[PDB]
Design an enzyme around this catalytic site. Structure first.
Site, short mmCIF file in Angstrom:
data_model
loop_
_atom_site.label_atom_id
_atom_site.label_comp_id
_atom_site.label_asym_id
_atom_site.label_seq_id
_atom_site.Cartn_x
_atom_site.Cartn_y
_atom_site.Cartn_z
N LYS A 1 -19.94 6.28 -13.60
CA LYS A 1 -18.75 7.11 -13.84
C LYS A 1 -17.59 6.70 -12.95
O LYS A 1 -16.52 6.40 -13.48
CB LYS A 1 -19.07 8.60 -13.70
N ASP B 1 -6.99 15.11 -5.69
CA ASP B 1 -7.04 13.66 -5.65
C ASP B 1 -8.45 13.21 -5.35
O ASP B 1 -9.25 13.94 -4.77
CB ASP B 1 -6.03 13.09 -4.64
N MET B 2 -8.78 12.01 -5.81
CA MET B 2 -10.13 11.56 -5.60
C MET B 2 -10.23 10.07 -5.51
O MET B 2 -9.54 9.33 -6.25
CB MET B 2 -11.07 12.08 -6.68
N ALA B 3 -11.07 9.64 -4.58
CA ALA B 3 -11.50 8.27 -4.53
C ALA B 3 -12.62 8.11 -5.53
O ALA B 3 -13.45 9.02 -5.74
CB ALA B 3 -11.97 7.90 -3.12
N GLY C 1 -8.57 20.95 -4.10
CA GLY C 1 -7.53 20.65 -3.12
C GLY C 1 -7.15 21.82 -2.23
O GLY C 1 -6.29 21.66 -1.34
N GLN C 2 -7.78 22.98 -2.43
CA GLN C 2 -7.37 24.17 -1.67
C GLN C 2 -7.56 23.96 -0.17
O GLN C 2 -6.68 24.27 0.63
CB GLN C 2 -8.13 25.41 -2.11
N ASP C 3 -8.70 23.38 0.20
CA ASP C 3 -8.98 23.12 1.61
C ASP C 3 -7.90 22.26 2.27
O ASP C 3 -7.56 22.49 3.43
CB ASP C 3 -10.36 22.49 1.78
N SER D 1 -6.42 -1.10 -5.55
CA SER D 1 -6.73 -1.16 -4.14
C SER D 1 -7.54 -2.44 -3.82
O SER D 1 -8.14 -3.04 -4.71
CB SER D 1 -7.51 0.10 -3.75
N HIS E 1 0.84 -1.20 0.00
CA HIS E 1 0.00 0.00 0.00
C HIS E 1 0.88 1.26 0.00
O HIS E 1 1.83 1.37 0.80
CB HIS E 1 -0.90 -0.05 1.24
#
Lengths: 337, 315
Positions: free
Chosen positions: A224, A174-176, A306-308, A140, A116
């Site tokens: 999607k 980034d995204m799951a 991603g700003q947060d 994953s 991982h």
């Protein structure tokens, strides 16, 4: 709890070197974990150290891997990772991706057979600090139904992207490909909280609000997220000749066995297409303009992607990393698992 | 109505409207592909818009194509605002050629018209035995997550990969919940719309299609990041207008759109056995289609399967 970046790093590096990892490998692993915590991605943070430690001592994660960087073309390579820790293999691959894109404009590098790798946006930030566009993705643990399905096939295959703006600025997304992470389900199990019906599904593929009923996760935006995790599996698994989809090793299957996971990096040197200075200015302009958008009622602000997390990461350098309490208590002692 | 029929019809009309025959056929091809797959948003309902733009010079009937190779695996096709179908196809051919020799290819299409159903271009790559990825900029129409102003378009993404024999896996997605042509569609229907599709001038979700100002991103911040990513890769990277600056379809039928598109092509041989790759792709498609459906569903499709079937039976 709350500690600084540097101390948390030290602790994680210690616990992992004690499990049996080399010093530098444990440092890298630790580096990637604290990165995640600093950004508020705690599921890929220090929480995973205990799991990591047990797998390291049982020899599931290789502590003496024989890496081999196979260069297959001017812009392509596979890093055979001999089931090394994922954080280590992936970063090494990214470093080769970076120097290749530097010389030849573009790089596509597979990481073959690794554990991982943590928050994969770490690796794309790496490309961005070198002034390049980075894209990364990996397989994953199988936990998700296909759209309209009731059996598990793909994992929560993540995708990340980063590009540089002026100075130190970096836009990181980034995204799951799922609605929610598996940990959120085990956490509501650890609460008798009842979950939203959009997160997950029982063994019949019927969505559920009972976290104890949950057998698999749903893909983001139906077909999607489904297509996206399919794509990530093809690109970081089937492309590399690795076990794919259903075949991918689960987290607690065999602690004594390598995961055999795959990851793919893609790096693009903007200099090979247009002015890199103007590129960076346009990135910085994007970030400003998006943050200047009139928010809908309810919202305090519009973020650029991603700003947060960037704000959290910056608030962390000042104030310290937030960390759920007992992980800290685990980290100091002499017990691995 | 046969496939060579609409093609020869559209080839005819567009060649009348101004285009080279070679260009009219190619645009025809791509519009023909799209209708077959039930992608009516991009099928032959669009010939007249195209014909107008061609005749009015807003699409270049005599583009000065320039393919500039920038590296062993990179190139820009300077498209001179040619029809997007022609430009995108051309860059894909070069990308296929490049991947075939050097293993990988990243090719930008710089300054082109709308390219249509972009899945067409990745299928090209898959037909050649390669993995294809494509994405492009779009007419600004979407609010950022939490936003009341428009910035990005419905920037699409497509992916295809070869299976055994003639099998191809093809996936494409819009980064919005719904397309603009269901919003204008619902005004001619006069019919309420789901509150998931679009917002008003204040960025409040709306059921009233006449009160739609902007579309919403798919999965909130996720489709938002994705349309950003596509804009950076197909626009900013190429030094083209980006974000809000991207031109709209209806602003100016005399003006070049100046859109960008990015192709990425990967030759499996540079990573592993193409034979095993294709075998495993075919296995994936089989296994997924054989997955037990959830109630409500009659089957599980591998991505794109339902369109794959439609362009068997529409033929």
């Amino acid at each position: 709890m709350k500690i600084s970046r540097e101390t948390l790093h030290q602790l994680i590096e210690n616990k992992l070197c004690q499990a049996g990892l080399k010093r530098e490998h444990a440092a890298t692993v630790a580096e990637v974990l604290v990165y995640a915590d600093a950004r508020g991605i705690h599921s890929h943070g220090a929480v995973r150290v205990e799991y990591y430690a047990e797998r390291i001592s049982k020899g599931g994660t290789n502590r003496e891997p024989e890496f081999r960087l196979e260069e297959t073309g001017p812009c392509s390579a596979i890093l055979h990772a001999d089931n090394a820790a994922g954080q280590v293999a992936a970063k090494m691959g990214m470093e080769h991706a970076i120097k290749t894109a530097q010389q030849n404009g573009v790089a596509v590098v597979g990481i073959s057979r690794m554990g991982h790798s943590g928050a994969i946006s770490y690796f794309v930030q790496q490309a961005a600090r070198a002034g390049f566009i980075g894209i990364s993705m990996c397989q994953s643990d199988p936990m998700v139904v296909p759209f309209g399905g009731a059996e598990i096939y793909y994992g929560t295959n993540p995708l990340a992207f980063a590009a540089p703006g002026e100075g130190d600025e970096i836009l990181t997304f980034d995204m799951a490909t799922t609605v929610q992470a598996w940990g959120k389900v085990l956490d509501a199990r650890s609460r008798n909280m009842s979950i939203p019906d959009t997160w997950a599904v029982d063994k019949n593929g019927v969505p559920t609000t009972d976290p104890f009923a949950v057998h698999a996760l749903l893909p983001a935006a139906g077909p999607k997220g489904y297509g996206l995790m399919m794509m990530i599996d093809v690109l970081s698994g089937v492309l590399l000749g690795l076990p794919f989809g259903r075949q991918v090793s689960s987290m607690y299957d065999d602690l004594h066995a390598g995961r055999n996971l795959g990851q793919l990096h893609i790096v693009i040197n903007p200099n090979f297409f247009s002015s890199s200075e103007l590129f960076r200015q346009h990135l910085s302009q994007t970030m400003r303009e998006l943050n200047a958008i009139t928010p809908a009622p309810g919202f305090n602000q519009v973020y650029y992607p991603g700003q947060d997390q960037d704000i959290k990461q910056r608030k962390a350098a000042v104030e310290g990393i937030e960390i759920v309490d007992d992980i800290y208590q685990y980290l100091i002692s002499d017990a691995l698992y």
